[PDB]
Design a protein around this ligand. Structure first.
Ligand SMILES: O=C(O)c1ccc2c(c1)C(=O)N([C@H](Cc1cccc3ccccc13)C(=O)O)C2=O
Length: 358
């Protein structure tokens, strides 16, 4: 399997694993549309279980790409509109600060300062209502971007309401099943527990804890194979036979807002290709990525641009993931690890690999 891919991947990932003390890692390169897989180290150090192509990793915020596409699919189905008020789908949400906050704002972190995290103390449905009712925006809608689980988490929950399906049922039936992502889960079933890697934080084995709107913002677990197939599907949506899903994928990669050289999609973030590597690498740092930044509205949104670097970083306490692809070039990468190591190290590695193959 072509020596160039082997050498480029190994020369980049070996030092990375060494420098970052990553216990286990899986990488897929999609090259001319076909996947090539690489694995290192341990899914479970104590039980000596190796990382394989069937190992499940916590995607953390890479989950938002699925939420975005599921939202796009609901738009394509005519179930929701991004221009609709949040209150259309949550009538109990009567506080006046919600006037003018649309599903677009929720999906794209531009509601006006919804927090990074839903508070841990928010457990019940009543707690959730109270939280959003009592939330006071720092900014007018559609003026500042502040990356937030509480923002896209709510979008995900509201997007599926007209369907009558739970978020998990909607995701399963409308995204996972059609794309044959048969080892991708919001809740890992007992049958698949043997494949579920431990995450490692400060040397301790850890898994993500339950939280409000977790499924919607950070709750997906997947294998390197399914994630490669996810990249393939997002690289080439016209190959997808389910029409609403094909359209949903395209809607997720539309450009809604710009800040600096990045464009906000639904879950996905995009930059023009060719990229300045410094820009994506430094920009991935959560110093920049989690900062409040002014946005320029793209009125109307630009349809998915083929000459894009399309990507998403994501983490949990014990895992670090990165996905990136370039539609123009039929080129992509997935990097899954059971340590949460710094974003810029991920993106640097990804750049080196894809730039060498481009
Ligand atoms: O272990 C957990 O329970 C857990 C759950 C969700 C996220 C994380 C951990 C997590 O690190 N992230 C980040 C974003 C994030 C969310 C919430 C608080 C954060 C604090 C510092 C850095 C990133 C955070 C990501 O996906 O990159 C998450 O979105």
């Amino acid at each position: 399997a072509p020596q160039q891919i082997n050498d480029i991947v190994h020369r980049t990932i070996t030092p990375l694993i060494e420098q970052q003390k990553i216990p286990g890692m899986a990488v897929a390169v999609i090259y001319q549309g076909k996947p090539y897989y690489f694995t290192w180290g341990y899914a479970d150090i104590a039980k000596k279980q190796p990382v394989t192509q069937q190992t499940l990793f916590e995607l953390g915020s890479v989950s938002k790409t699925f939420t975005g596409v599921l939202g796009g699919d609901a738009i394509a189905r005519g179930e929701i509109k991004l221009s609709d008020p949040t209150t259309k789908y949550w009538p109990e949400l009567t506080a006046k600060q919600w006037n003018g906050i649309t599903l677009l704002h929720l999906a794209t972190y531009t509601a006006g300062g919804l927090p990074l995290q839903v508070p841990d103390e928010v457990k019940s449905s009543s707690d959730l209502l109270r939280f959003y009712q009592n939330w006071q925006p720092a900014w007018a809608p559609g003026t500042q971007r502040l990356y937030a689980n509480s923002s896209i988490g709510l979008f995900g929950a509201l997007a599926v309401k007209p369907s009558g399906l739970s978020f998990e049922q909607a995701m399963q039936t409308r995204v996972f099943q059609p794309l044959k992502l048969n080892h991708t889960w919001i809740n890992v079933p007992p049958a698949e527990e043997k494949n579920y890697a431990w995450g490692y934080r400060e040397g301790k084995a850890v898994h993500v804890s339950p939280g409000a709107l977790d499924a919607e913002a950070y709750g997906v677990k997947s294998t390197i194979e399914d994630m490669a197939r996810w990249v393939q599907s997002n690289l080439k949506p016209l190959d997808i036979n389910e029409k609403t899903l094909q359209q949903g994928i395209q809607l997720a990669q539309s450009r809604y807002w710009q800040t600096g050289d990045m464009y906000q999609g639904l879950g996905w973030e995009m930059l023009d290709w060719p990229v300045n590597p410094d820009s994506i690498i430094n920009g991935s740092d959560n110093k920049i990525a989690l900062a409040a930044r002014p946005v320029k509205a793209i009125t109307p949104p630009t349809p998915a641009v083929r000459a894009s670097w399309v990507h998403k970083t994501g983490a949990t306490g014990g895992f670090g993931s990165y996905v990136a692809f370039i539609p123009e070039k039929e080129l992509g990468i997935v990097m899954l690890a059971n340590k949460n190591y710094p974003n810029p190290a991920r993106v640097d590695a990804a750049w080196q690999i894809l730039n060498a193959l481009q």
